[PDB]
Scaffold this active site. Structure first.
Site, short mmCIF file in Angstrom:
data_model
loop_
_atom_site.label_atom_id
_atom_site.label_comp_id
_atom_site.label_asym_id
_atom_site.label_seq_id
_atom_site.Cartn_x
_atom_site.Cartn_y
_atom_site.Cartn_z
N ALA A 190 0.83 -1.20 0.00
CA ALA A 190 0.00 0.00 0.00
C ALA A 190 0.86 1.24 0.00
O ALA A 190 2.03 1.20 0.36
CB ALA A 190 -0.88 0.01 1.25
N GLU A 233 2.42 1.05 -6.17
CA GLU A 233 2.97 0.60 -4.90
C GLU A 233 3.18 -0.92 -4.89
O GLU A 233 4.09 -1.42 -4.22
CB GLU A 233 2.05 1.04 -3.74
CG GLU A 233 2.05 2.57 -3.52
CD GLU A 233 3.29 3.07 -2.79
OE1 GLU A 233 3.53 4.30 -2.80
OE2 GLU A 233 4.03 2.26 -2.20
N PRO A 286 -10.79 9.03 11.20
CA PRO A 286 -11.43 10.32 10.90
C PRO A 286 -11.37 11.39 11.96
O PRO A 286 -11.58 12.56 11.65
CB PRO A 286 -12.86 9.93 10.51
CG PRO A 286 -13.07 8.62 11.21
CD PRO A 286 -11.75 7.91 11.14
N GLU A 336 13.76 5.47 0.79
CA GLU A 336 14.49 5.59 2.03
C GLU A 336 13.27 5.79 2.91
O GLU A 336 12.34 6.51 2.54
CB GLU A 336 15.35 6.86 2.04
CG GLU A 336 16.69 6.69 1.35
CD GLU A 336 16.62 5.77 0.14
OE1 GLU A 336 15.88 6.09 -0.82
OE2 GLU A 336 17.31 4.73 0.15
N1 LIG Z 1 4.50 9.95 9.30
C1 LIG Z 1 5.54 9.91 8.47
N2 LIG Z 1 6.72 10.64 8.70
C2 LIG Z 1 7.82 10.58 7.84
N3 LIG Z 1 7.77 9.76 6.71
C3 LIG Z 1 6.61 9.02 6.48
C4 LIG Z 1 5.50 9.09 7.33
N4 LIG Z 1 4.52 8.28 6.86
C5 LIG Z 1 5.00 7.68 5.72
N5 LIG Z 1 6.28 8.12 5.48
C6 LIG Z 1 7.23 7.71 4.39
O1 LIG Z 1 6.72 7.63 3.06
C7 LIG Z 1 7.34 6.49 2.35
C8 LIG Z 1 6.52 5.61 1.38
O2 LIG Z 1 5.29 5.36 1.87
P1 LIG Z 1 4.03 4.68 1.13
O3 LIG Z 1 3.59 5.53 -0.08
O4 LIG Z 1 2.99 4.73 2.19
O5 LIG Z 1 4.28 3.21 0.74
C9 LIG Z 1 8.11 5.69 3.40
O6 LIG Z 1 9.47 5.64 3.10
C10 LIG Z 1 7.83 6.36 4.72
O7 LIG Z 1 8.96 6.46 5.56
MG LIG Z 2 3.61 1.39 1.64
MG LIG Z 3 4.58 5.73 -1.89
MG LIG Z 4 5.51 2.40 -0.72
#
Ligand SMILES: Nc1ncnc2c1ncn2[C@@H]1O[C@H](COP(=O)(O)O)[C@@H](O)[C@H]1O
Ligand SMILES: [Mg+2]
Ligand SMILES: [Mg+2]
Ligand SMILES: [Mg+2]
Ligand SMILES: Nc1ncnc2c1ncn2[C@@H]1O[C@H](COP(=O)(O)O)[C@@H](O)[C@H]1O
Ligand SMILES: [Mg+2]
Ligand SMILES: [Mg+2]
Ligand SMILES: [Mg+2]
Lengths: 182, 182
Positions: free
Chosen positions: A74, A90, A112, A137
């Site tokens: 996701a 993703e 929510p 990263e």
């Molecule tokens: N609350 C957060 N603070 C800093 N980075 C975040 C946070 N939530 C998600 N990320 C970053 O966004 C990236 C990819 O996320 P995703 O699109 O959810 O698969 C990851 O490398 C996470 O470290």
């Molecule tokens: Mg993810």
């Molecule tokens: Mg992402």
């Molecule tokens: Mg991702």
């Protein structure tokens, strides 16, 4: 027709996550400060099922919890991207997989009371690994493959701690039985 | 054994919600700033079912979404309070109801990428209204009563947008069928 009126909206953080603190006048005529992650913002969740009746999942570190959780692939929907495109992207980034049909499942708000985010779940059929994952990263995860019977046993046993993954599995179940994969 | 090492933890907000911004050294040896709602923190969710096979729910305004959502009564667990006590307390505050047995359902994290919060769901039996609700400033909701068949029809139709409420309903279903209430 909002029941609460904005007095002042302050941005507390812009990156890596936008957060606001809003002073509002409520239904009681009194003032209140509400803190939240503003919209519009979304993420797509995808249960990738193979033709062999297995699911491609991830075991991912979630820092706020200090745990590695079993989840479906996701991620955040990028600006101007559709939820289905984000789901496929993703899936490719996190598991290195592609799929054929994506069946949309009911969208939901994870929390929510705090965030405007909408999560869009999908059931992906004929999922298959075609390339190495490409993680950002910040992403610490490993992909794995589990028979659907085992995944649903874990669900029934209350072992799936990630709410979105659990809900996606519950919504996907009838479709999987209908398709003969479960 | 955390995979990420803390460099510095900064509190961005203390009230009404505590939020932190943490600079960490990741598994790649590089630095990253992670923003989150720290733990330990929890909330209890309770599906209150009457002896007549109906459920006591709430239609509540959730500001971040700008919508009034259909949810089961729920609320934050106060310091030193058990999840069951919080469930009973919020049921009394939001719907003015009490119940007999509370069956614990699988706990879950609503959004582990952002918050450490753990949600504790319960199925409450013999729920009954005994007093007027006692809502806090900030709570804008109305309680209602719906036959379980209708609540589950809404679930099946994908109309329950609150994830926690939807997940609580899915976990409660087998128990309700076993007890003869559904
Ligand atoms: N609350 C957060 N603070 C800093 N980075 C975040 C946070 N939530 C998600 N990320 C970053 O966004 C990236 C990819 O996320 P995703 O699109 O959810 O698969 C990851 O490398 C996470 O470290
Ligand atoms: Mg993810
Ligand atoms: Mg992402
Ligand atoms: Mg991702
Ligand atoms: N993100 C938030 N910012 C400000 N107040 C909040 C926030 N989340 C929950 N609350 C308040 O906490 C109160 C009771 O919540 P609960 O214990 O969840 O039933 C409500 O009156 C809410 O307005
Ligand atoms: Mg509440
Ligand atoms: Mg409360
Ligand atoms: Mg409350």
């Amino acid at each position: 027709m909002s029941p609460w009126e904005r007095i002042l909206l302050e941005e507390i953080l812009s990156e890596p996550v936008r957060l606001v603190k809003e002073r509002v006048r409520t239904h009681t005529g009194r003032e209140l400060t509400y803190v939240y992650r503003p919209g519009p913002v979304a993420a797509s969740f995808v249960l990738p099922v193979t033709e062999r009746g297995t699911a491609l999942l991830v075991r991912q570190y979630r820092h706020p919890t200090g745990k590695f959780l079993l989840e479906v692939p996701a991620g955040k929907v990028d600006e101007g991207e559709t939820p289905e495109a984000a789901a496929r992207r993703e899936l490719r980034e996190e598991v290195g997989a592609e799929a054929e049909t994506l069946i949309p499942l009911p969208s939901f708000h994870p929390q929510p009371s705090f965030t405007a985010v909408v999560f869009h779940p999908f059931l992906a059929l004929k999922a298959r690994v075609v390339t190495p994952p490409t993680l950002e990263e910040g992403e610490l995860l490993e992909s794995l493959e589990l028979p659907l019977t085992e995944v649903y046993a874990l669900l029934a046993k209350g072992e799936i701690q990630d709410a979105s993954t659990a809900l996606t599995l519950f919504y996907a179940e009838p479709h999987l039985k209908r398709l003969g994969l479960l």
